[PDB]
Amino acid sequence: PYTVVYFPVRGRCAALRMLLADQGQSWKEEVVTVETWQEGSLKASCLYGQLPKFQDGDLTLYQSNTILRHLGRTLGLYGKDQQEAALVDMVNDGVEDLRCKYISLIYTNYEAGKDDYVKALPGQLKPFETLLSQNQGGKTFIVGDQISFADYNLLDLLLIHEVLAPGCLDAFPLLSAYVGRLSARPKLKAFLASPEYVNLPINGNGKQ
Amino acid sequence: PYTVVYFPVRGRCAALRMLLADQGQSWKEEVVTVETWQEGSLKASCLYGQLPKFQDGDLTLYQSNTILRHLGRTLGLYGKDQQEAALVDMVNDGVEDLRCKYISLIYTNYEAGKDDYVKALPGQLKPFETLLSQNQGGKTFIVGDQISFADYNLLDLLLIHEVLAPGCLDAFPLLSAYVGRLSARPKLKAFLASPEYVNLPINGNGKQ
């Protein structure tokens, strides 16, 4: 089945877990403690010396976006055709770009950079609002009319930014409604409310 | 057909162009000059305010990796099955991670950071040598026995690092042979030797 190996944080595993939960999939969580990591053996066995590590049967995967695409491909959350698949990738790459900036802020200079970051935020979120506006008025998903792995990734990005800059989605009605709508999906709603998700810190350094 | 809209540099378009050339595809190049960009209109029309922009018929794509995956998907350069497709993604994500570090070095602090970067390089390249060693002895491609979009992206990454740190592939026999072997593919060899490629700077700030 599935096994996700990661630190005890939401971080880069938040989206794929939301995906797994919402899709009614069962998975095992192998928590890696900072002590176990600093020991060296696991790190060395990891392709790029990092987590998340994912196992699907004897297929071992590394890289959060690789796991998302893999699950999207095998579970049918990758568009209805090649054109949609490309748009899904375009959205995910955009999400990843902002996530990189967010991770940098959180870990390198949260203190001095938070203000400029939050100021620049609207311009960073605008593209997703625009995408929504061009797809059935933003009433369905980020691409097409079926959920895709990019939806889960974008949802997580929006959720963590609401914690970082409360009200950042107020100026974006489509994104706002989008978060509410997806967060309401039964299995996902249950998962988001569960201790498994709620009792995990967003990041590893206590900042958010 | 295909149209690539980008600045007059190899940068993030190098790999997809190598891919197009080697696959015998025809494409149009729309060069964007720094003057045209600073004018504002094009930037504003770009989803994430950036290039490359790619057109395949009326499908407009942004994000270099989205274009690579799209071409991989439509041209059959994405593995023979889902398992290989996942490994292809894992390699491309790894390539993109190192490319991000390279781009950072080149544009933010080439001066003070070059030494530490080149020192850390072997550890960054090792994973790809390892992948090669586990796939038919590294005699074919990065994943499976057919070329994939990740091959072109990895090849470009290796080529630009040879310019940044001459001899960085000396310690990696599989990667070395890999570059030589792929660079020898007829159409690719011709493309790499052509003015279209050779007369373009690797980066936009004259550093490499």
From Swiss-Prot, chains A, B:
E.C. no: 2.5.1.18
List each copy of the GST N-terminal domain by range.
1-79
What is annotated about its quaternary structure and interactions?
A: Homodimer. Interacts with CDK5.
Which catalysed reactions does the entry list for this protein? Answer: RX + glutathione = an S-substituted glutathione + a halide anion + H(+); prostaglandin J2 + glutathione = prostaglandin J2-S-(R)-glutathione; prostaglandin J2 + glutathione = prostaglandin J2-S-(S)-glutathione; prostaglandin A2 + glutathione = prostaglandin A2-S-(S)-glutathione
GO cellular component, alphabetical, reads: cytoplasm; cytosol; extracellular exosome; extracellular region; extracellular space; ficolin-1-rich granule lumen; mitochondrion; nucleus
Protein function: Conjugation of reduced glutathione to a wide number of exogenous and endogenous hydrophobic electrophiles. Involved in the formation of glutathione conjugates of both prostaglandin A2 (PGA2) and prostaglandin J2 (PGJ2). Participates in the formation of novel hepoxilin regioisomers. Negatively regulates CDK5 activity via p25/p35 translocation to prevent neurodegeneration.
Name the chain's protein.
Glutathione S-transferase P
Task: Cite the Gene3D superfamilies for this sequence.
Answer: 1.20.1050.10, Glutaredoxin (3.40.30.10)
Q: Which residues carry this modification: Phosphothreonine?
A: 60
Mention one GO biological process in which this protein takes part, according to its record.
Answer: negative regulation of smooth muscle cell chemotaxis
Q: Which residues carry this modification: N6-succinyllysine?
A: 101, 114
Record's keyword terms, sorted: Acetylation, Cytoplasm, Lipid metabolism, Mitochondrion, Nucleus, Phosphoprotein, Transferase
Concerning PROSITE patterns, the annotation shows: GST_CTER, GST_NTER
Where does the GST C-terminal domain lie? 81-202
The family annotation for this protein states: Belongs to the GST superfamily. Pi family.
Q: Which organism is it from?
A: Homo sapiens
Which SUPFAM superfamilies does this entry report, sorted A to Z? GST C-terminal domain-like, Thioredoxin-like
Residues with PTM N6-acetyllysine: 126
| Domain of life of the source | Eukaryota
- Compartments (UniProt record): Cytoplasm; Mitochondrion; Nucleus
Q: Which residues carry this modification: Phosphotyrosine?
A: 2, 197
- Tell me the GO molecular function terms: dinitrosyl-iron complex binding; fatty acid binding; glutathione peroxidase activity; glutathione transferase activity; JUN kinase binding; nitric oxide binding; protein serine/threonine kinase inhibitor activity; S-nitrosoglutathione binding
Phosphoprotein as a keyword of this entry, yes or no, is yes
The entry marks the following residues as binding glutathione, namely 6, 12, 37, 43, 50-51, 63-64
